[PDB]
Amino acid sequence: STGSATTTPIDSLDDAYITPVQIGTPAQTLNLDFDTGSSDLWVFSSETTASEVDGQTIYTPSKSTTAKLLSGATWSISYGDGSSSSGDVYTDTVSVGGLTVTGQAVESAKKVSSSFTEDSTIDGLLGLAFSTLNTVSPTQQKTFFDNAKASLDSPVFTADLGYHAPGTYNFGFIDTTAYTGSITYTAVSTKQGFWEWTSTGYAVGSGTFKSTSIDGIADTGTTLLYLPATVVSAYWAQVSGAKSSSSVGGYVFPCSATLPSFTFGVGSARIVIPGDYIDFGPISTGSSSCFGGIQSSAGIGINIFGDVALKAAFVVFNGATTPTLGFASK
């Protein structure tokens, strides 16, 4: 089997992407944030504290003839941005782009933190990291991809995120019309539960490529590109007036600037992020200070190849017995 679904930016900055997902019988369609940096499929629901729901579409398990309470199971998750959610668990039928999994754990939120409430466009998350990170207790549950894998034509999914435009998540096949050149594959460590890999270096604008190993994660659920402070300083030094602002929380730059591109290495191959992809607009409405899309990872503990990096590529998440990542230009 295969599936193919369009993913759409939630706003004019590409702050996140939503993909429609059918849950239950009859189908309830919710727009989920596909997140290769986590491993829980959770939704706003009829069980979510009413004051914490503000415009989201909810899953109502009592209206699904295929929903079953997973008795005793609870979940609770905290994300790198400080947001969080928790609740109980149903199993139900879940379909993405025509690919159906029966018995998928659907984690129903009883509580969500303010940032989820405040984002009316995201109805939940669909985790695509390794199932070892799933938070369901006392019986850990599998991701949608893990459940589908055996049925797929090939044990892969691909992320093709758009810049200021829709893109595609495919399951079970590699669309050879969706990229240019060849796909370069690189090794993955699953030791932390992530799609963790080592970039071979970087360049700023037209500058020379610096060969240096950068370990980080391919994370569709993170907006920006988070890299070591040395790399990030080298980038922003090429933008007149750019500075790190403790009060804003990262590098800012004059909105009048034209940003240089940023290149990252995948083996001997190179992925170029155009400068425009690094502009996240005014820090507050009407400001002439703009927020940068490349930020330091120094306070995180891990480097994160988020959407800024991934949307410059066609990315293969290869879930074979030994997983690997593939990157192609497009």
Short mmCIF file of C-alpha atoms in Angstrom, two decimals:
data_model
loop_
_atom_site.label_atom_id
_atom_site.label_comp_id
_atom_site.label_asym_id
_atom_site.label_seq_id
_atom_site.Cartn_x
_atom_site.Cartn_y
_atom_site.Cartn_z
CA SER A 1 0.00 0.00 0.00
CA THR A 2 0.88 3.69 -0.20
CA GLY A 3 -0.50 7.03 0.93
CA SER A 4 -0.06 10.60 -0.28
CA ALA A 5 -1.31 13.73 1.48
CA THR A 6 -0.82 17.43 0.90
CA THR A 7 0.65 19.46 3.77
CA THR A 8 -0.16 23.17 4.00
CA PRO A 9 1.54 26.02 5.90
CA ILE A 10 -0.59 27.32 8.76
CA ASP A 11 0.37 30.97 8.13
CA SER A 12 2.35 33.27 5.86
CA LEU A 13 5.63 32.47 7.65
CA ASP A 14 5.50 28.66 7.37
CA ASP A 15 5.46 28.46 11.18
CA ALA A 16 4.17 24.88 10.87
CA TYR A 17 2.40 22.65 8.37
CA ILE A 18 -0.94 20.84 8.70
CA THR A 19 -1.98 17.63 6.96
CA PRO A 20 -5.55 16.29 6.95
CA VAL A 21 -6.02 12.96 8.75
CA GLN A 22 -9.17 10.82 8.83
CA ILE A 23 -9.93 9.31 12.26
CA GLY A 24 -12.77 6.94 13.10
CA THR A 25 -15.93 5.65 11.44
CA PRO A 26 -17.53 7.66 9.89
CA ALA A 27 -14.36 9.63 9.27
CA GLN A 28 -13.62 12.68 11.38
CA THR A 29 -11.04 14.79 9.54
CA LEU A 30 -8.56 16.69 11.71
CA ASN A 31 -5.62 18.79 10.55
CA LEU A 32 -2.52 17.45 12.28
CA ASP A 33 1.07 18.68 12.57
CA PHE A 34 3.24 15.80 11.30
CA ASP A 35 6.25 15.80 13.63
CA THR A 36 9.33 13.69 12.89
CA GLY A 37 10.68 14.85 16.27
CA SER A 38 8.07 13.13 18.45
CA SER A 39 6.17 9.86 18.57
CA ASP A 40 2.63 10.54 19.85
CA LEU A 41 -0.48 10.94 17.73
CA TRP A 42 -2.67 13.17 19.90
CA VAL A 43 -5.76 15.22 19.14
CA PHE A 44 -8.03 17.87 20.51
CA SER A 45 -11.14 15.98 21.53
CA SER A 46 -14.54 16.01 23.18
CA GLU A 47 -12.56 15.34 26.39
CA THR A 48 -10.37 18.46 26.16
CA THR A 49 -11.05 21.02 28.91
CA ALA A 50 -13.51 23.37 27.25
CA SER A 51 -11.63 26.56 28.18
CA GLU A 52 -8.56 25.17 26.39
CA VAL A 53 -10.33 24.72 23.03
CA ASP A 54 -10.47 27.83 20.82
CA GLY A 55 -11.44 27.00 17.24
CA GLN A 56 -9.81 23.59 16.77
CA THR A 57 -11.68 20.68 15.26
CA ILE A 58 -12.17 17.95 17.86
CA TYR A 59 -12.23 14.16 17.72
CA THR A 60 -15.32 12.72 19.43
CA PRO A 61 -14.67 9.02 20.07
CA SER A 62 -18.27 8.38 21.13
CA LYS A 63 -19.32 9.14 17.53
CA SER A 64 -16.90 6.60 16.02
CA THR A 65 -18.15 3.03 15.76
CA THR A 66 -14.54 1.78 15.58
CA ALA A 67 -13.19 3.66 18.61
CA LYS A 68 -12.27 1.63 21.70
CA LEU A 69 -10.95 2.97 24.99
CA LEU A 70 -7.45 1.64 25.63
CA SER A 71 -8.25 0.86 29.23
CA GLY A 72 -5.89 2.33 31.81
CA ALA A 73 -3.65 4.06 29.28
CA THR A 74 -2.59 7.68 29.79
CA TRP A 75 -0.13 9.95 28.07
CA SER A 76 1.69 13.17 28.87
CA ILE A 77 4.20 15.00 26.70
CA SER A 78 6.37 18.12 26.87
CA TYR A 79 7.97 19.61 23.79
CA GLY A 80 11.19 21.54 23.31
CA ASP A 81 9.31 24.83 23.05
CA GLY A 82 7.87 24.35 26.54
CA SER A 83 4.39 23.36 25.37
CA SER A 84 2.64 20.25 26.65
CA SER A 85 -0.50 18.12 26.56
CA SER A 86 -1.89 15.01 28.25
CA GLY A 87 -4.90 12.72 28.39
CA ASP A 88 -6.19 9.19 27.80
CA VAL A 89 -6.10 6.87 24.78
CA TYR A 90 -8.43 5.25 22.26
CA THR A 91 -7.64 2.90 19.43
CA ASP A 92 -9.34 3.71 16.14
CA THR A 93 -8.93 3.59 12.38
CA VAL A 94 -6.64 6.31 11.05
CA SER A 95 -6.07 7.12 7.38
CA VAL A 96 -3.55 9.49 5.81
CA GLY A 97 -3.77 10.20 2.10
CA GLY A 98 -5.52 6.89 1.40
CA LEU A 99 -3.29 4.73 3.65
CA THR A 100 -5.29 3.15 6.49
CA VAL A 101 -4.10 1.76 9.84
CA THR A 102 -6.58 -0.06 12.03
CA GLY A 103 -6.02 -0.13 15.78
CA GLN A 104 -3.92 3.04 15.85
CA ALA A 105 -3.47 4.63 19.27
CA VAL A 106 -5.25 8.01 19.17
CA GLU A 107 -4.25 9.98 22.25
CA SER A 108 -7.16 12.15 23.34
CA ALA A 109 -6.17 15.38 25.06
CA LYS A 110 -7.76 16.23 28.36
CA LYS A 111 -5.38 19.18 28.86
CA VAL A 112 -3.28 21.24 26.47
CA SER A 113 -0.96 24.16 27.20
CA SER A 114 -1.69 27.71 26.13
CA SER A 115 0.29 27.67 22.88
CA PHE A 116 -1.86 24.82 21.56
CA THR A 117 -5.09 26.57 22.58
CA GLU A 118 -3.91 29.78 20.93
CA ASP A 119 -3.25 28.07 17.59
CA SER A 120 -6.67 27.38 16.12
CA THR A 121 -5.20 25.82 12.96
CA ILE A 122 -3.54 22.75 14.57
CA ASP A 123 -5.93 20.03 15.76
CA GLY A 124 -3.15 17.80 17.15
CA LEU A 125 0.14 16.16 16.29
CA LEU A 126 1.06 13.01 14.39
CA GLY A 127 4.46 11.79 15.59
CA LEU A 128 6.88 10.21 13.12
CA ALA A 129 10.00 9.72 15.25
CA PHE A 130 10.81 6.26 16.62
CA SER A 131 8.20 4.54 18.76
CA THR A 132 10.64 4.29 21.68
CA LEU A 133 9.73 7.95 22.41
CA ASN A 134 5.98 7.34 22.64
CA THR A 135 4.68 8.50 26.03
CA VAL A 136 1.69 6.17 26.53
CA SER A 137 1.80 4.40 29.89
CA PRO A 138 1.79 1.63 31.01
CA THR A 139 1.89 0.11 27.50
CA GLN A 140 3.90 2.15 25.03
CA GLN A 141 2.22 2.54 21.64
CA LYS A 142 3.48 2.55 18.05
CA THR A 143 3.47 5.47 15.64
CA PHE A 144 1.28 5.56 12.54
CA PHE A 145 4.35 4.84 10.40
CA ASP A 146 5.44 1.91 12.57
CA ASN A 147 1.94 0.40 12.35
CA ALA A 148 1.74 0.92 8.57
CA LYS A 149 5.30 -0.14 7.74
CA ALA A 150 4.75 -3.83 7.05
CA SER A 151 1.90 -3.07 4.61
CA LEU A 152 3.77 -0.37 2.69
CA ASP A 153 5.27 -1.09 -0.71
CA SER A 154 8.59 0.18 0.70
CA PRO A 155 9.22 0.97 4.40
CA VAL A 156 9.68 4.71 3.90
CA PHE A 157 7.96 8.04 4.10
CA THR A 158 9.01 11.31 2.47
CA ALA A 159 8.68 14.97 3.46
CA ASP A 160 8.47 17.55 0.68
CA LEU A 161 7.66 20.79 2.47
CA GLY A 162 6.93 23.94 0.49
CA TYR A 163 8.29 27.45 0.91
CA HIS A 164 5.22 29.65 1.34
CA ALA A 165 3.30 26.91 -0.49
CA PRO A 166 1.79 23.45 0.05
CA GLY A 167 3.88 20.30 -0.14
CA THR A 168 3.49 16.56 0.28
CA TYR A 169 3.94 13.68 2.71
CA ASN A 170 4.16 10.32 0.93
CA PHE A 171 4.12 6.90 2.59
CA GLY A 172 5.49 3.74 1.03
CA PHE A 173 7.07 5.10 -2.15
CA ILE A 174 9.58 7.64 -3.43
CA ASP A 175 8.15 10.02 -6.07
CA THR A 176 11.04 10.27 -8.51
CA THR A 177 9.39 13.31 -10.17
CA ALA A 178 9.54 15.33 -6.93
CA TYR A 179 13.28 16.05 -6.80
CA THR A 180 16.21 16.90 -9.05
CA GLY A 181 19.46 15.00 -9.33
CA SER A 182 20.03 12.06 -7.00
CA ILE A 183 19.11 11.32 -3.38
CA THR A 184 22.10 11.16 -1.03
CA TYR A 185 21.57 8.80 1.89
CA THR A 186 23.27 9.19 5.25
CA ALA A 187 23.42 7.14 8.43
CA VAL A 188 20.92 7.52 11.28
CA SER A 189 21.33 6.90 14.99
CA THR A 190 18.12 5.89 16.76
CA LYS A 191 19.76 5.96 20.21
CA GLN A 192 17.81 9.07 21.29
CA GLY A 193 14.65 8.07 19.42
CA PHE A 194 15.12 10.71 16.70
CA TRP A 195 16.05 10.76 13.02
CA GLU A 196 19.54 11.78 14.10
CA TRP A 197 22.28 12.19 11.52
CA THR A 198 25.58 14.01 10.96
CA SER A 199 25.88 16.82 8.44
CA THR A 200 29.30 17.14 6.82
CA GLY A 201 29.54 20.95 7.03
CA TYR A 202 28.20 24.27 5.88
CA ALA A 203 28.71 27.38 3.78
CA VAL A 204 27.36 30.92 4.13
CA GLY A 205 26.26 32.57 0.91
CA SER A 206 28.90 32.21 -1.79
CA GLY A 207 31.58 31.46 0.82
CA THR A 208 33.77 28.41 0.93
CA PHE A 209 32.40 25.21 2.41
CA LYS A 210 33.60 24.39 5.92
CA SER A 211 33.98 20.65 6.46
CA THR A 212 32.86 19.88 10.01
CA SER A 213 30.61 17.24 11.53
CA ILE A 214 27.28 18.57 12.84
CA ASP A 215 25.13 15.98 14.61
CA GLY A 216 21.45 16.89 14.63
CA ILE A 217 17.89 15.71 14.05
CA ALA A 218 15.56 15.98 11.05
CA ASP A 219 12.51 17.51 12.75
CA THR A 220 9.48 18.56 10.73
CA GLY A 221 7.81 19.74 13.92
CA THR A 222 10.38 22.48 14.59
CA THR A 223 10.05 25.68 12.55
CA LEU A 224 13.66 26.91 12.49
CA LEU A 225 17.21 25.67 11.94
CA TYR A 226 19.12 25.39 15.25
CA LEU A 227 22.89 24.96 14.93
CA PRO A 228 26.01 25.47 17.06
CA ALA A 229 26.71 29.04 18.12
CA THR A 230 29.92 29.16 16.04
CA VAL A 231 28.03 28.33 12.83
CA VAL A 232 25.16 30.70 13.59
CA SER A 233 27.54 33.58 14.41
CA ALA A 234 29.34 33.00 11.11
CA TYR A 235 26.03 33.23 9.24
CA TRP A 236 24.71 36.39 10.89
CA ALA A 237 28.08 38.15 10.64
CA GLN A 238 27.32 38.38 6.92
CA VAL A 239 24.16 40.46 7.52
CA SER A 240 24.72 44.14 8.30
CA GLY A 241 23.09 45.08 11.58
CA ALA A 242 22.20 41.54 12.66
CA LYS A 243 22.63 40.81 16.35
CA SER A 244 21.60 38.36 19.03
CA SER A 245 18.91 39.91 21.23
CA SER A 246 18.41 38.39 24.67
CA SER A 247 15.15 40.32 25.01
CA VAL A 248 13.71 38.97 21.77
CA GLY A 249 15.20 35.50 22.24
CA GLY A 250 17.59 35.10 19.32
CA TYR A 251 19.17 36.67 16.30
CA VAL A 252 17.32 39.57 14.71
CA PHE A 253 18.22 41.52 11.62
CA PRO A 254 17.08 44.68 9.81
CA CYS A 255 13.98 43.93 7.79
CA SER A 256 15.61 45.94 4.96
CA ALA A 257 18.35 43.29 4.58
CA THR A 258 18.77 40.79 1.77
CA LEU A 259 19.79 37.54 3.47
CA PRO A 260 22.52 35.21 2.17
CA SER A 261 21.81 31.58 1.50
CA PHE A 262 22.99 28.82 3.84
CA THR A 263 24.33 25.49 2.56
CA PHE A 264 24.51 22.27 4.58
CA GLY A 265 26.35 19.08 3.67
CA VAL A 266 24.84 15.62 3.28
CA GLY A 267 27.80 13.38 2.65
CA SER A 268 29.47 14.84 -0.42
CA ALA A 269 26.20 16.49 -1.52
CA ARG A 270 24.99 19.99 -0.68
CA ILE A 271 21.54 21.40 0.12
CA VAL A 272 21.14 25.17 -0.40
CA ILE A 273 18.65 27.09 1.75
CA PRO A 274 17.83 30.35 -0.10
CA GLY A 275 18.19 33.50 1.97
CA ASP A 276 14.47 34.24 1.77
CA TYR A 277 13.73 31.00 3.66
CA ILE A 278 15.61 32.48 6.66
CA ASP A 279 13.34 35.55 7.01
CA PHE A 280 10.67 35.12 9.70
CA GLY A 281 9.41 38.67 9.49
CA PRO A 282 8.93 41.45 11.99
CA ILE A 283 9.43 40.57 15.65
CA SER A 284 6.15 42.37 16.38
CA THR A 285 3.63 43.89 14.01
CA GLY A 286 5.09 46.92 12.25
CA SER A 287 8.62 46.50 13.59
CA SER A 288 11.61 46.97 11.32
CA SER A 289 13.50 44.29 13.26
CA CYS A 290 13.01 40.87 11.71
CA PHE A 291 13.46 37.45 13.30
CA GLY A 292 16.08 35.08 11.93
CA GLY A 293 15.40 31.55 10.76
CA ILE A 294 18.82 30.22 11.81
CA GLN A 295 19.30 30.28 15.60
CA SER A 296 21.74 28.87 18.13
CA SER A 297 21.13 25.42 19.57
CA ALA A 298 23.38 26.20 22.54
CA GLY A 299 20.48 26.18 25.03
CA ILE A 300 18.76 23.09 23.59
CA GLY A 301 21.28 20.28 23.91
CA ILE A 302 20.81 19.13 20.29
CA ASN A 303 21.05 20.62 16.82
CA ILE A 304 17.74 20.67 14.95
CA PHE A 305 17.30 20.59 11.18
CA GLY A 306 13.79 22.02 11.31
CA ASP A 307 11.48 23.21 8.57
CA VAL A 308 13.84 26.00 7.38
CA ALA A 309 16.34 23.31 6.35
CA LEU A 310 13.99 20.49 5.40
CA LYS A 311 11.82 22.56 3.06
CA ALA A 312 14.90 23.19 0.87
CA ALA A 313 15.06 19.44 0.17
CA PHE A 314 13.14 16.31 -0.70
CA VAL A 315 13.71 14.19 2.41
CA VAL A 316 13.43 10.39 2.63
CA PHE A 317 12.83 8.85 6.06
CA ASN A 318 13.94 5.27 5.39
CA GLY A 319 12.52 2.95 8.04
CA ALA A 320 14.26 -0.19 6.86
CA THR A 321 15.79 -2.50 9.48
CA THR A 322 18.76 -0.12 9.58
CA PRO A 323 17.13 3.31 9.14
CA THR A 324 18.75 6.01 7.02
CA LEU A 325 17.91 9.53 5.82
CA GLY A 326 18.00 10.69 2.20
CA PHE A 327 18.23 14.26 0.93
CA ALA A 328 17.80 15.55 -2.61
CA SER A 329 17.59 19.03 -4.07
CA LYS A 330 14.30 19.97 -5.72
#
